[PDB]
Structure 1
């Protein structure tokens, strides 16, 4: 329920991912719009020997301070003013374990070439402490597929990405998943009802279930969660079965 039940093909892929988890090889990952490819990564990291090691996942390419790539390894403060440099860094935080990337999609072509070169050769040096790169323990990249690079060539510098052919993982649509979708929805509903402290599950008309099934699920299980939330809030009661399920909060009446 709170874990990744996953479809049958998704189950086989999950087995493959849990296996590749011990493989600390650098990776680039792809999940759907609202599939949630992160939880499988956490399950793998637990399955990886890097489970004990730190697994700092990239913070969506956040742009705090001017260190930027030197945010990967920087200094804290001059001794005369403040505190010691104390060797704190971003590329260093994921120490002894996994290292996950996020919001890799948003980048332009220049930083794309930079990342490609870092893959080719990586060094970490900071005014404050730091430690040698070229380790990148259990490295894995994610969220790049949200914005494709060089799809028709051009865009970001993904020619090297074509050259850099470390293994990748696709993402089938939720509509194409054909898993226990109603079961996952029920699990989410029960979790919400507990969170909502609801009297009980009011129920759902199987006709309502089939009607809600008439949807592309563009946000995948995230779309499922949002639609369930809207449908339940519309129900707002535990009395009678939900003959209504939320198509879209954007509408009129």
Structure 2
């Protein structure tokens, strides 16, 4: 089963999920932030409402503003998440204009409408791997938004800090790949392979571990001998 640090996350999420308070998830790529956001939704009373997601980094300023708040129609992500949960990833990339508008939605529960407003009821979950307090000091993140956004913070441990989970998950992914390519048995990892796995920093965390292990099993391609060559870098 999962490491103590990850179990402590799951326990935190079970307590946070029922609240209608905004949650901030801090974690590297491939640590499962969106999955945690989804768990907060499905363990909440809003579980039958919508779960909407948006990656702030993916859009330029003008498109981000329209995608989040709408452009009268083109309903934005807040309107689409009404009665449910909205997950905003890579929050630190949101331009200052969007951050100010986000604060207003959090505190007033309304979207502005020029002329011709919308009240919305959305539980907000955001994610980042930036140091938001540091960006506040730099002027690149709003202090007021951070004061209202981070009711509580869920910090996902990177794989490198869950060394116990690395061989567990590696074996899991290896077995699944053996099924996919019809090997009769996963023949295990050599000690050399284990050193490679446990010494590497996994900057891509769980996604990268899966990719690495699946490639390695395929390249090895046999059940007759233990897997010795962990192919971290497919470019070599």
Settle same-fold status: TM greater than 0.5.
yes
Specify whether residues 206 and 128 from structure 1 end up closer, same or farther in structure 2 by C-alpha distance, changes over 3 A only.
farther
Instruction: Show CA shifts across 1:63-100 (max 9, x none).
Output: 49977534445478xxxxxxxxx884421211322221
Specify whether residues 153 and 64 from structure 1 end up closer, same or farther in structure 2 by C-alpha distance, changes over 3 A only.
closer
The 8 Å contact of residues 102 and 144 in structure 1, kept in 2 or not, is answered as no
TM-score (norm 2): 0.80
Instruction: Show CA shifts across 1:157-208 (max 9, x none).
Output: 3464256542112232322123332111111122223333444323321342
Specify whether residues 24 and 197 from structure 1 end up closer, same or farther in structure 2 by C-alpha distance, changes over 3 A only.
farther
The 8 Å contact of residues 71 and 89 in structure 1, kept in 2 or not, is answered as yes
Deviation at 1:150, TM superposition (A): 1.5
Specify whether residues 89 and 230 from structure 1 end up closer, same or farther in structure 2 by C-alpha distance, changes over 3 A only.
same
Tell me which moved more, 209-218 or 16-25: 209-218
The 8 Å contact of residues 72 and 124 in structure 1, kept in 2 or not, is answered as no
Deviation at 1:11, TM superposition (A): 0.6
Deviation at 1:23, TM superposition (A): 1.0
**Structure (1/2) with the larger strand percentage:** 2
Specify whether residues 160 and 146 from structure 1 end up closer, same or farther in structure 2 by C-alpha distance, changes over 3 A only.
closer
The 8 Å contact of residues 73 and 89 in structure 1, kept in 2 or not, is answered as yes
Specify whether residues 248 and 63 from structure 1 end up closer, same or farther in structure 2 by C-alpha distance, changes over 3 A only.
closer
User: What's the counterpart of residue 13 of structure 1?
Assistant: 9
Deviation at 1:20, TM superposition (A): 0.8
CA–CA separation in structure 2 for the residues paired with 1:71 and 1:40: 23
CA–CA separation in structure 1 for the residues paired with 2:58 and 2:161: 33
User: What's the counterpart of residue 113 of structure 1?
Assistant: 100
Deviation at 1:25, TM superposition (A): 0.8
SS of aligned partner of 1:237: coil
CA–CA separation in structure 1 for the residues paired with 2:145 and 2:74: 32
For these two proteins, the number of residue pairs brought into alignment is 236
Structure 2 gaps of 5+ residues are none
The 8 Å contact of residues 34 and 221 in structure 1, kept in 2 or not, is answered as yes
User: What's the counterpart of residue 66 of structure 1?
Assistant: 62
**Structure (1/2) with the larger helix percentage:** 2
CA–CA separation in structure 2 for the residues paired with 1:73 and 1:151: 23
The 8 Å contact of residues 106 and 147 in structure 1, kept in 2 or not, is answered as no
- Over the residues paired in the alignment, what is the CA RMSD in angstroms? 3.4
Within a 5 Å distance, the mapping from 1:1-253 to structure 2 comes to 5-60=1-56, 62-63=58-59, 68-72=64-68, 74=70, 88-124=75-111, 135-143=120-128, 145=130, 150=135, 152-158=137-143, 160-162=145-147, 164-251=149-236
Structure 1 gaps of 5+ residues are 77-85
**Which of 1 and 2 has greater Rg?**
1
The 8 Å contact of residues 166 and 198 in structure 2, kept in 1 or not, is answered as no
SS of aligned partner of 1:50: coil
